[PDB]
Amino acid sequence: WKQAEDIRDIYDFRDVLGTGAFSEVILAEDKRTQKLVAIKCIAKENEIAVLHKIKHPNIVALDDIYESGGHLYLIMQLVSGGELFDRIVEKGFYTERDASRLIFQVLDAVKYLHDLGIVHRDLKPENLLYYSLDEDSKIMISDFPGYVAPEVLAQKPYSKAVDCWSIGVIAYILLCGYPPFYDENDAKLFEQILKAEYEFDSPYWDDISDSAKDFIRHLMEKDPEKRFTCEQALQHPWIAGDTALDKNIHQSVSEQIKKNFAKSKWKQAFNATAVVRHM
Numbered sequence: 001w002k003q004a005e006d007i008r009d010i011y012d013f014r015d016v017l018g019t020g021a022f023s024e025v026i027l028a029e030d031k032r033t034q035k036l037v038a039i040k041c042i043a044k045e046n047e048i049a050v051l052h053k054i055k056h057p058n059i060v061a062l063d064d065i066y067e068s069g070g071h072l073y074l075i076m077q078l079v080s081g082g083e084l085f086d087r088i089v090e091k092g093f094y095t096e097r098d099a100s101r102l103i104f105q106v107l108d109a110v111k112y113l114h115d116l117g118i119v120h121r122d123l124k125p126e127n128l129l130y131y132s133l134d135e136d137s138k139i140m141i142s143d144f145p146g147y148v149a150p151e152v153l154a155q156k157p158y159s160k161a162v163d164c165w166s167i168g169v170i171a172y173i174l175l176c177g178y179p180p181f182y183d184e185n186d187a188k189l190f191e192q193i194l195k196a197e198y199e200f201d202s203p204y205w206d207d208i209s210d211s212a213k214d215f216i217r218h219l220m221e222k223d224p225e226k227r228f229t230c231e232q233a234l235q236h237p238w239i240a241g242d243t244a245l246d247k248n249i250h251q252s253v254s255e256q257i258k259k260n261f262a263k264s265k266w267k268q269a270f271n272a273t274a275v276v277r278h279m
Contacts, residue, residue: 020268081130168219177256
């Protein structure tokens, strides 16, 4: 931990990244290189030391660590592309290939974690942020209901296989815009979930490839042992192959996302403008 008399000796603070979760992260400029960075102040060790060495293209890195006063300052890798949903909703052209490249990157990052012994456990659409505002931008896993694995809910010993269910869920949403499990009152929803009751609904899933449906089923498998490992999912023709279609499914997906994942801009927002403004 590089000691520092004051973190401000090293970085010039700008604005916070957004609201909710994002208000805990400070955008700042590296005085020396003028490089823009995200900074989380952990008031005050091994977890952090572990994180420090987790290196993957699609996970948000912890570049450096500085200790100043009674706090730990985690200099994080900065992303400026904003939230997954925000971007897709404003895409205009979205297809199965786009969804598959997204799922791929997530599996690529997650398998990386599993090999590293780590299990995410809390993997959902909110944790995915576009590296940048570029169209070819890669999706990144930031932090480190229907999303949470069945065996978890059932209070059974979780496995690394929990992450793979979550990914199947995400894949589902990326192909239709609505969650695969929903019901008025929780109790009725929870049985649907704990029993893996879901469907590639008639209107919505009319132009989705059977392959995608198959890929999903195997991840969204109630039986943990019958469930695709991150490696198997990566071997599936939808991911490693050429089965993903390039038909624009933006309309239904976009339409469903707005109805299903609506929330205030003051709730838990990533102020992409603040980054690009100082970019």
